RNA sequence: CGAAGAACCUUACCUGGCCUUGACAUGCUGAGAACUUUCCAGAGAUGGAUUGGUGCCUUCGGGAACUCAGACACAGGUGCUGCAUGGCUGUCGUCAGCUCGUGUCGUGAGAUGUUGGGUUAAGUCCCGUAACGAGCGCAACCCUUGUCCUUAGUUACCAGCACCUCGGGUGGGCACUCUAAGGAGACUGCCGGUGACAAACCGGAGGAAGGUGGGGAUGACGUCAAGUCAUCAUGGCCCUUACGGCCAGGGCUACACACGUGCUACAAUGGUCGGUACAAAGGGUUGCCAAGCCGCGAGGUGGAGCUAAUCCCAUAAAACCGAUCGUAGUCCGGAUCGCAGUCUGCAACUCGACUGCGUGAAGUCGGAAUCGCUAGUAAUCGUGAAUCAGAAUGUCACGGUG
């Protein structure tokens, strides 16, 4: 495994003037349906401005940082015993963990009018009663039972 | 199938072995290997020996058999 | 004169872009810019090299584009107008080489190969 | 395994053996002429060794250049075979036929001429290697820069399919720039069928 | 004038055999114009008894080439047609 | 086989023999302005011809080999005689490409 | 998976009907020119009528041409052997190896070169060294895509010019796009650091492109007695009053079951209806089959234009816009099935494809397990070709959105 991987960049959001939202828009697109997914992300953006008077970017700015975790396990097996090691999440990685958890719980929300499913997800995570926040903190609890394996056979 | 521009179908040697064999009436079965032809109201009530593939089987012609061809009344495959 | 000819190709498209001094006259294939590109973000992407070089109000723009796809023609104009802006001088050369606008995107589609089904996808075995 | 050394170089090294344009309504009516001409001519000219039979089509008739290394056998007493075949090539190929004959000076540097002699020697019950150690050095006193000869088949044995392999010099095969000849002529002994392959390498570029 | 052959080392090397040998005789003949090229792919199977995923695919080309006179006054090229046809060039005449 | 090329040689004769009446008998039937009495007796002349006259009975086999499957009509050759005759420079204008 | 097309034909198999120098080759003996017979019998094969034809080169003797019969050698074989073999392909594996000459060491089978240090996609290079060299391979040579230059302007092209009926429609123009010929460009070249400063390595500028730019063809010595005698070629072995020929119907498409690939679906990032926007690539004078035209619709008329940058195939779909649909086994899904039609073909019963109308299933994301893919890629939406009278969810091929 010679190290090869360079970096490709996508940063385009002219109708709002943002950068995090464009990368979040790519996690919603299925099979290249970009124009469909573009009006749903704005469709769940204006309902927050309908709901809260604050600029809904900052609601999205707050909802990331209550779904984004800090440490997580890593099942590195010693070759004769299956161990798990709580590891520090790299700062570049920890953005995409929240955005990928957020969409997958929006699809099982079970409402009508699809942009209302994602609307309720970004409202809860500014408070903490979301299922993504409950899925965040449970994996946080898995690390301290794992904390004995932090350095030793790790 | 067999659109109504080209309306009927019957075989030529079958026709002379029936239309003349009406004039001397039903005292014999008609042994014929042909299966591509229909039956017609010129033929209601005859006795045809349609080729199975290895033998001939008799046919009792009725009045309500008119549109269907001879192939639906000879067998092909047994499956006992 | 002051007429400036600009071409640009991206994803089997080709755009004739003419550039001359005027007042915001943006017309493409005898259509308005908001009318031609129906409901997309690329309505502003054609302005992105223009508003970077602070000349958004100072020119007539006459565009004729052929072939390609929907959002592939919009990229042809963006590459096309950058070649038309650099007929003046190289003052805006460094403002666009650094911007990543002048290089033609070479990424073209790849052919179906035998045994495979797509360009690289292959059927399942067991 | 080792794609044919003419079919990769039609272009940069060699050209076709037959040039003629044809429409899509007559293209498959000139091929069936030109493919049973070559089966005819080689069965007649079994002796007076033949390497290449080219066919041009000028305006509406024909042209054929039969190559032999011994033209005096074919042109015998001023064309007693030339006009005799020219009457009878028209009977298979309805156009009037030209017949032209050149020489193949240095006959030991073209692969068809060499490999016909191998079938002659190996059907006279000559040893499988004394025939071929002498058929390479003779083709290395004059000319080529590399020769491979593979001899595969029954090779006299009971249940034996061995391959003789002898090489001299330099023969590339993954260079399209080079110039390689190739020929496969066979042999029918009193038991088995022996196939012979020849890879005469002339100069490069 | 229009020309059809199978390789560009004949058909684009016989136009100079016509452009030079007609402009010499006084009449003006402009530069030849290329056309699109016929391309026909033939994917054939290669194994005698079956093994399907081993294949081989060829291609046959056809080059076209169009001349253009200005003033027709020369029957010189009409006699020099057997010269300008060499091996595989077909010339349909359009003496404009 | 060799006895099987020979029986599908004479099919090509009998199709190209008649070849003109069956155009006329199918010119009569295909007209909407034609009368069915002129059609019904025209049906008689079709079925009393021998059936090996239609093109659907004809089967384009390879001309040098005889193998039915793997035939092309821009040549006259089979699937596996076309390869051996093309590598020897015979077929003009034919190369490999990509 | 041979199969790039099983209604019959293909076709080998089955049931019969029917042939014996033969459907076909050469030699022999006779017979008539060939041809045309428009007719009946018969499922056909075939059998018998059958107006007619009487050529052709003539040392005018006949010859050759064909067709019929007799007899002999024979013909013929998809019958067995892929462990008797040639030919052609898979496989390890596009993996980086595999060998020879001369020399020296060893009683000999061997070994050394081809090991060591560094480095590389690489037995690729550098420094070392009882080995010095050479070949096959890797690299390059080839194709294609991306930049520019020159040569070229109809059927392609419209910036300038008038013209216009406002359609490059027209005059016109050779600026362009495009097309295709011929060229330049990229070499670790240059800057810095790093290494033994030596291969190289990490950064940097310029540049359309930066470190084999992306793709393709190209698979070494060999392996598996791998596969094929049914593509073809052949040694031998058997059949030769049939294991060979001929013609009808049937069959390969049967059917409690099990496994392999592939398509739709299971819905609201959807479903309908009404508008509206942009492609490449290819086939077409034994063909494409327009306009008009009649049909609920598949189509029927109709016959142009066309031997192709001209004419036709030929309307790209997703996207966008407005409407309804409120997440219900459903304005979901479409299997099954009844009825009614058109098209090809001598012929749609077993057994074709599509169209109308009606009916409406299983299915609410699918165990243990298990496979594909590193960027114009996966995922999703269409289009074309080969084979082909007719018949693609497969094969090959080209583009959208990404």
PDB file of N, CA and C (backbone and C1' of nucleotides) in Angstrom, chain G residues 23-52:
ATOM      1  P     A G  23     -29.133 -40.028 -56.150  1.00  0.00           P
ATOM      2  O5'   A G  23     -29.334 -38.754 -55.218  1.00  0.00           O
ATOM      3  C5'   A G  23     -29.863 -37.545 -55.737  1.00  0.00           C
ATOM      4  C4'   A G  23     -29.048 -36.356 -55.298  1.00  0.00           C
ATOM      5  C3'   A G  23     -27.623 -36.291 -55.830  1.00  0.00           C
ATOM      6  O3'   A G  23     -27.542 -35.747 -57.135  1.00  0.00           O
ATOM      7  C1'   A G  23     -27.607 -35.899 -53.507  1.00  0.00           C
ATOM      8  P     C G  24     -26.458 -36.312 -58.175  1.00  0.00           P
ATOM      9  O5'   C G  24     -25.052 -35.864 -57.573  1.00  0.00           O
ATOM     10  C5'   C G  24     -24.533 -34.564 -57.811  1.00  0.00           C
ATOM     11  C4'   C G  24     -23.332 -34.280 -56.942  1.00  0.00           C
ATOM     12  C3'   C G  24     -22.013 -34.893 -57.392  1.00  0.00           C
ATOM     13  O3'   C G  24     -21.352 -34.146 -58.401  1.00  0.00           O
ATOM     14  C1'   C G  24     -22.327 -35.291 -55.080  1.00  0.00           C
ATOM     15  P     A G  25     -20.545 -34.905 -59.568  1.00  0.00           P
ATOM     16  O5'   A G  25     -19.066 -34.318 -59.488  1.00  0.00           O
ATOM     17  C5'   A G  25     -18.367 -34.265 -58.253  1.00  0.00           C
ATOM     18  C4'   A G  25     -17.041 -34.981 -58.317  1.00  0.00           C
ATOM     19  C3'   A G  25     -16.741 -35.728 -59.603  1.00  0.00           C
ATOM     20  O3'   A G  25     -16.268 -34.870 -60.624  1.00  0.00           O
ATOM     21  C1'   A G  25     -16.163 -37.067 -57.729  1.00  0.00           C
ATOM     22  P     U G  26     -16.564 -35.207 -62.164  1.00  0.00           P
ATOM     23  O5'   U G  26     -15.492 -36.327 -62.522  1.00  0.00           O
ATOM     24  C5'   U G  26     -14.103 -36.050 -62.440  1.00  0.00           C
ATOM     25  C4'   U G  26     -13.280 -37.309 -62.509  1.00  0.00           C
ATOM     26  C3'   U G  26     -13.546 -38.215 -63.694  1.00  0.00           C
ATOM     27  O3'   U G  26     -12.963 -37.764 -64.900  1.00  0.00           O
ATOM     28  C1'   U G  26     -13.402 -39.516 -61.733  1.00  0.00           C
ATOM     29  P     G G  27     -13.706 -38.065 -66.292  1.00  0.00           P
ATOM     30  O5'   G G  27     -13.477 -39.624 -66.520  1.00  0.00           O
ATOM     31  C5'   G G  27     -12.179 -40.116 -66.803  1.00  0.00           C
ATOM     32  C4'   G G  27     -12.090 -41.613 -66.662  1.00  0.00           C
ATOM     33  C3'   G G  27     -13.020 -42.445 -67.521  1.00  0.00           C
ATOM     34  O3'   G G  27     -12.659 -42.496 -68.891  1.00  0.00           O
ATOM     35  C1'   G G  27     -12.944 -43.347 -65.351  1.00  0.00           C
ATOM     36  P     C G  28     -13.803 -42.397 -70.019  1.00  0.00           P
ATOM     37  O5'   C G  28     -14.564 -43.793 -69.919  1.00  0.00           O
ATOM     38  C5'   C G  28     -13.877 -45.007 -70.173  1.00  0.00           C
ATOM     39  C4'   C G  28     -14.780 -46.206 -70.046  1.00  0.00           C
ATOM     40  C3'   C G  28     -15.976 -46.244 -70.975  1.00  0.00           C
ATOM     41  O3'   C G  28     -15.643 -46.613 -72.299  1.00  0.00           O
ATOM     42  C1'   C G  28     -16.633 -46.904 -68.800  1.00  0.00           C
ATOM     43  P     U G  29     -16.392 -45.909 -73.529  1.00  0.00           P
ATOM     44  O5'   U G  29     -17.808 -46.628 -73.568  1.00  0.00           O
ATOM     45  C5'   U G  29     -17.903 -48.014 -73.851  1.00  0.00           C
ATOM     46  C4'   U G  29     -19.329 -48.493 -73.796  1.00  0.00           C
ATOM     47  C3'   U G  29     -20.373 -47.564 -74.383  1.00  0.00           C
ATOM     48  O3'   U G  29     -20.408 -47.517 -75.794  1.00  0.00           O
ATOM     49  C1'   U G  29     -21.144 -48.372 -72.313  1.00  0.00           C
ATOM     50  P     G G  30     -20.627 -46.095 -76.507  1.00  0.00           P
ATOM     51  O5'   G G  30     -22.212 -45.941 -76.582  1.00  0.00           O
ATOM     52  C5'   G G  30     -22.997 -46.879 -77.300  1.00  0.00           C
ATOM     53  C4'   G G  30     -24.394 -46.997 -76.746  1.00  0.00           C
ATOM     54  C3'   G G  30     -25.330 -45.835 -77.017  1.00  0.00           C
ATOM     55  O3'   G G  30     -25.851 -45.822 -78.334  1.00  0.00           O
ATOM     56  C1'   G G  30     -25.520 -46.462 -74.762  1.00  0.00           C
ATOM     57  P     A G  31     -25.994 -44.428 -79.120  1.00  0.00           P
ATOM     58  O5'   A G  31     -27.220 -43.706 -78.407  1.00  0.00           O
ATOM     59  C5'   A G  31     -28.514 -44.288 -78.418  1.00  0.00           C
ATOM     60  C4'   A G  31     -29.424 -43.623 -77.420  1.00  0.00           C
ATOM     61  C3'   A G  31     -29.646 -42.134 -77.620  1.00  0.00           C
ATOM     62  O3'   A G  31     -30.609 -41.847 -78.617  1.00  0.00           O
ATOM     63  C1'   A G  31     -29.152 -42.550 -75.354  1.00  0.00           C
ATOM     64  P     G G  32     -30.174 -41.077 -79.960  1.00  0.00           P
ATOM     65  O5'   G G  32     -31.388 -40.091 -80.251  1.00  0.00           O
ATOM     66  C5'   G G  32     -31.199 -38.686 -80.241  1.00  0.00           C
ATOM     67  C4'   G G  32     -31.746 -38.062 -78.982  1.00  0.00           C
ATOM     68  C3'   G G  32     -31.462 -36.579 -78.812  1.00  0.00           C
ATOM     69  O3'   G G  32     -32.388 -35.754 -79.498  1.00  0.00           O
ATOM     70  C1'   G G  32     -30.919 -37.716 -76.813  1.00  0.00           C
ATOM     71  P     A G  33     -31.896 -34.742 -80.647  1.00  0.00           P
ATOM     72  O5'   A G  33     -30.986 -33.680 -79.889  1.00  0.00           O
ATOM     73  C5'   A G  33     -31.478 -32.927 -78.792  1.00  0.00           C
ATOM     74  C4'   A G  33     -30.337 -32.470 -77.927  1.00  0.00           C
ATOM     75  C3'   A G  33     -30.698 -31.856 -76.587  1.00  0.00           C
ATOM     76  O3'   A G  33     -30.964 -32.825 -75.589  1.00  0.00           O
ATOM     77  C1'   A G  33     -29.130 -30.484 -77.674  1.00  0.00           C
ATOM     78  P     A G  34     -32.065 -32.547 -74.451  1.00  0.00           P
ATOM     79  O5'   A G  34     -31.547 -31.244 -73.692  1.00  0.00           O
ATOM     80  C5'   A G  34     -30.533 -31.322 -72.699  1.00  0.00           C
ATOM     81  C4'   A G  34     -29.983 -29.959 -72.359  1.00  0.00           C
ATOM     82  C3'   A G  34     -30.914 -29.026 -71.595  1.00  0.00           C
ATOM     83  O3'   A G  34     -30.869 -29.243 -70.193  1.00  0.00           O
ATOM     84  C1'   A G  34     -30.014 -27.882 -73.449  1.00  0.00           C
ATOM     85  P     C G  35     -32.195 -29.126 -69.292  1.00  0.00           P
ATOM     86  O5'   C G  35     -33.093 -28.032 -70.022  1.00  0.00           O
ATOM     87  C5'   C G  35     -33.077 -26.668 -69.621  1.00  0.00           C
ATOM     88  C4'   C G  35     -33.697 -25.787 -70.677  1.00  0.00           C
ATOM     89  C3'   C G  35     -35.198 -25.561 -70.559  1.00  0.00           C
ATOM     90  O3'   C G  35     -35.525 -24.512 -69.662  1.00  0.00           O
ATOM     91  C1'   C G  35     -34.661 -26.169 -72.780  1.00  0.00           C
ATOM     92  P     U G  36     -36.654 -24.716 -68.536  1.00  0.00           P
ATOM     93  O5'   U G  36     -38.028 -24.680 -69.342  1.00  0.00           O
ATOM     94  C5'   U G  36     -38.498 -23.482 -69.945  1.00  0.00           C
ATOM     95  C4'   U G  36     -39.633 -23.762 -70.895  1.00  0.00           C
ATOM     96  C3'   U G  36     -40.837 -24.464 -70.285  1.00  0.00           C
ATOM     97  O3'   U G  36     -41.739 -23.567 -69.661  1.00  0.00           O
ATOM     98  C1'   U G  36     -40.201 -25.577 -72.273  1.00  0.00           C
ATOM     99  P     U G  37     -42.527 -24.002 -68.333  1.00  0.00           P
ATOM    100  O5'   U G  37     -43.087 -25.457 -68.669  1.00  0.00           O
ATOM    101  C5'   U G  37     -44.439 -25.811 -68.421  1.00  0.00           C
ATOM    102  C4'   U G  37     -44.997 -26.652 -69.542  1.00  0.00           C
ATOM    103  C3'   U G  37     -45.708 -27.930 -69.132  1.00  0.00           C
ATOM    104  O3'   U G  37     -47.033 -27.716 -68.698  1.00  0.00           O
ATOM    105  C1'   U G  37     -44.241 -28.375 -70.935  1.00  0.00           C
ATOM    106  P     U G  38     -47.877 -28.932 -68.092  1.00  0.00           P
ATOM    107  O5'   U G  38     -48.913 -28.228 -67.110  1.00  0.00           O
ATOM    108  C5'   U G  38     -48.465 -27.403 -66.046  1.00  0.00           C
ATOM    109  C4'   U G  38     -48.816 -25.951 -66.282  1.00  0.00           C
ATOM    110  C3'   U G  38     -50.137 -25.664 -66.995  1.00  0.00           C
ATOM    111  O3'   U G  38     -51.235 -25.527 -66.100  1.00  0.00           O
ATOM    112  C1'   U G  38     -48.355 -24.336 -67.907  1.00  0.00           C
ATOM    113  P     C G  39     -51.881 -26.762 -65.295  1.00  0.00           P
ATOM    114  O5'   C G  39     -51.669 -28.021 -66.242  1.00  0.00           O
ATOM    115  C5'   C G  39     -52.768 -28.601 -66.917  1.00  0.00           C
ATOM    116  C4'   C G  39     -52.896 -30.069 -66.610  1.00  0.00           C
ATOM    117  C3'   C G  39     -53.046 -30.459 -65.150  1.00  0.00           C
ATOM    118  O3'   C G  39     -54.344 -30.257 -64.622  1.00  0.00           O
ATOM    119  C1'   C G  39     -51.539 -31.927 -66.229  1.00  0.00           C
ATOM    120  P     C G  40     -54.555 -30.215 -63.027  1.00  0.00           P
ATOM    121  O5'   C G  40     -54.575 -31.749 -62.570  1.00  0.00           O
ATOM    122  C5'   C G  40     -55.686 -32.584 -62.871  1.00  0.00           C
ATOM    123  C4'   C G  40     -55.352 -34.060 -62.826  1.00  0.00           C
ATOM    124  C3'   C G  40     -55.083 -34.679 -61.465  1.00  0.00           C
ATOM    125  O3'   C G  40     -56.262 -34.924 -60.720  1.00  0.00           O
ATOM    126  C1'   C G  40     -53.518 -35.497 -63.044  1.00  0.00           C
ATOM    127  P     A G  41     -56.219 -34.909 -59.113  1.00  0.00           P
ATOM    128  O5'   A G  41     -55.429 -36.237 -58.727  1.00  0.00           O
ATOM    129  C5'   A G  41     -56.002 -37.513 -58.961  1.00  0.00           C
ATOM    130  C4'   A G  41     -55.009 -38.627 -58.738  1.00  0.00           C
ATOM    131  C3'   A G  41     -54.309 -38.641 -57.395  1.00  0.00           C
ATOM    132  O3'   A G  41     -55.125 -39.148 -56.356  1.00  0.00           O
ATOM    133  C1'   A G  41     -52.734 -39.037 -59.103  1.00  0.00           C
ATOM    134  P     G G  42     -55.562 -38.187 -55.146  1.00  0.00           P
ATOM    135  O5'   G G  42     -54.339 -38.286 -54.134  1.00  0.00           O
ATOM    136  C5'   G G  42     -53.966 -39.541 -53.589  1.00  0.00           C
ATOM    137  C4'   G G  42     -52.479 -39.635 -53.371  1.00  0.00           C
ATOM    138  C3'   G G  42     -51.888 -38.627 -52.406  1.00  0.00           C
ATOM    139  O3'   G G  42     -52.050 -39.016 -51.055  1.00  0.00           O
ATOM    140  C1'   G G  42     -50.563 -38.725 -54.359  1.00  0.00           C
ATOM    141  P     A G  43     -52.752 -38.020 -50.013  1.00  0.00           P
ATOM    142  O5'   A G  43     -51.693 -36.848 -49.847  1.00  0.00           O
ATOM    143  C5'   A G  43     -52.077 -35.602 -49.294  1.00  0.00           C
ATOM    144  C4'   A G  43     -50.965 -34.992 -48.484  1.00  0.00           C
ATOM    145  C3'   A G  43     -49.640 -34.811 -49.209  1.00  0.00           C
ATOM    146  O3'   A G  43     -49.587 -33.600 -49.947  1.00  0.00           O
ATOM    147  C1'   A G  43     -49.272 -35.880 -47.131  1.00  0.00           C
ATOM    148  P     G G  44     -49.633 -33.600 -51.555  1.00  0.00           P
ATOM    149  O5'   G G  44     -48.167 -34.037 -51.990  1.00  0.00           O
ATOM    150  C5'   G G  44     -47.161 -33.064 -52.222  1.00  0.00           C
ATOM    151  C4'   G G  44     -45.920 -33.363 -51.426  1.00  0.00           C
ATOM    152  C3'   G G  44     -44.819 -34.115 -52.157  1.00  0.00           C
ATOM    153  O3'   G G  44     -43.992 -33.256 -52.922  1.00  0.00           O
ATOM    154  C1'   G G  44     -45.205 -35.110 -50.049  1.00  0.00           C
ATOM    155  P     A G  45     -43.322 -33.762 -54.290  1.00  0.00           P
ATOM    156  O5'   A G  45     -42.238 -34.833 -53.831  1.00  0.00           O
ATOM    157  C5'   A G  45     -41.025 -34.434 -53.213  1.00  0.00           C
ATOM    158  C4'   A G  45     -40.316 -35.618 -52.606  1.00  0.00           C
ATOM    159  C3'   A G  45     -39.857 -36.688 -53.581  1.00  0.00           C
ATOM    160  O3'   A G  45     -38.580 -36.407 -54.122  1.00  0.00           O
ATOM    161  C1'   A G  45     -41.048 -37.693 -51.800  1.00  0.00           C
ATOM    162  P     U G  46     -38.415 -35.942 -55.649  1.00  0.00           P
ATOM    163  O5'   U G  46     -39.220 -37.035 -56.481  1.00  0.00           O
ATOM    164  C5'   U G  46     -38.670 -38.323 -56.714  1.00  0.00           C
ATOM    165  C4'   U G  46     -39.719 -39.395 -56.586  1.00  0.00           C
ATOM    166  C3'   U G  46     -40.349 -39.875 -57.880  1.00  0.00           C
ATOM    167  O3'   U G  46     -39.545 -40.798 -58.589  1.00  0.00           O
ATOM    168  C1'   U G  46     -42.041 -39.461 -56.289  1.00  0.00           C
ATOM    169  P     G G  47     -39.426 -40.690 -60.187  1.00  0.00           P
ATOM    170  O5'   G G  47     -40.813 -41.269 -60.710  1.00  0.00           O
ATOM    171  C5'   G G  47     -41.218 -42.585 -60.371  1.00  0.00           C
ATOM    172  C4'   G G  47     -42.663 -42.826 -60.721  1.00  0.00           C
ATOM    173  C3'   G G  47     -43.079 -42.450 -62.127  1.00  0.00           C
ATOM    174  O3'   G G  47     -42.695 -43.412 -63.089  1.00  0.00           O
ATOM    175  C1'   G G  47     -44.689 -41.663 -60.602  1.00  0.00           C
ATOM    176  P     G G  48     -42.200 -42.936 -64.539  1.00  0.00           P
ATOM    177  O5'   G G  48     -43.538 -42.453 -65.254  1.00  0.00           O
ATOM    178  C5'   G G  48     -44.573 -43.380 -65.535  1.00  0.00           C
ATOM    179  C4'   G G  48     -45.864 -42.694 -65.897  1.00  0.00           C
ATOM    180  C3'   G G  48     -45.838 -41.793 -67.119  1.00  0.00           C
ATOM    181  O3'   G G  48     -45.885 -42.510 -68.339  1.00  0.00           O
ATOM    182  C1'   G G  48     -47.020 -40.734 -65.370  1.00  0.00           C
ATOM    183  P     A G  49     -45.451 -41.799 -69.714  1.00  0.00           P
ATOM    184  O5'   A G  49     -46.771 -41.055 -70.195  1.00  0.00           O
ATOM    185  C5'   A G  49     -46.740 -39.688 -70.572  1.00  0.00           C
ATOM    186  C4'   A G  49     -48.083 -39.041 -70.358  1.00  0.00           C
ATOM    187  C3'   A G  49     -48.384 -37.812 -71.202  1.00  0.00           C
ATOM    188  O3'   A G  49     -48.787 -38.148 -72.521  1.00  0.00           O
ATOM    189  C1'   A G  49     -48.943 -37.369 -68.959  1.00  0.00           C
ATOM    190  P     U G  50     -49.331 -37.042 -73.561  1.00  0.00           P
ATOM    191  O5'   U G  50     -48.615 -35.675 -73.157  1.00  0.00           O
ATOM    192  C5'   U G  50     -49.211 -34.434 -73.506  1.00  0.00           C
ATOM    193  C4'   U G  50     -48.413 -33.258 -73.005  1.00  0.00           C
ATOM    194  C3'   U G  50     -47.102 -32.978 -73.718  1.00  0.00           C
ATOM    195  O3'   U G  50     -47.267 -32.294 -74.943  1.00  0.00           O
ATOM    196  C1'   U G  50     -46.781 -32.836 -71.381  1.00  0.00           C
ATOM    197  P     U G  51     -46.141 -32.419 -76.082  1.00  0.00           P
ATOM    198  O5'   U G  51     -46.803 -31.692 -77.329  1.00  0.00           O
ATOM    199  C5'   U G  51     -48.210 -31.541 -77.405  1.00  0.00           C
ATOM    200  C4'   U G  51     -48.586 -30.106 -77.652  1.00  0.00           C
ATOM    201  C3'   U G  51     -47.624 -29.319 -78.526  1.00  0.00           C
ATOM    202  O3'   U G  51     -47.779 -29.581 -79.908  1.00  0.00           O
ATOM    203  C1'   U G  51     -48.216 -28.030 -76.634  1.00  0.00           C
ATOM    204  P     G G  52     -46.607 -30.331 -80.709  1.00  0.00           P
ATOM    205  O5'   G G  52     -45.283 -29.853 -79.970  1.00  0.00           O
ATOM    206  C5'   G G  52     -44.419 -28.907 -80.576  1.00  0.00           C
ATOM    207  C4'   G G  52     -44.304 -27.652 -79.751  1.00  0.00           C
ATOM    208  C3'   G G  52     -42.951 -26.966 -79.801  1.00  0.00           C
ATOM    209  O3'   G G  52     -42.778 -26.139 -80.938  1.00  0.00           O
ATOM    210  C1'   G G  52     -43.583 -27.226 -77.558  1.00  0.00           C
TER     211        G G  52
END
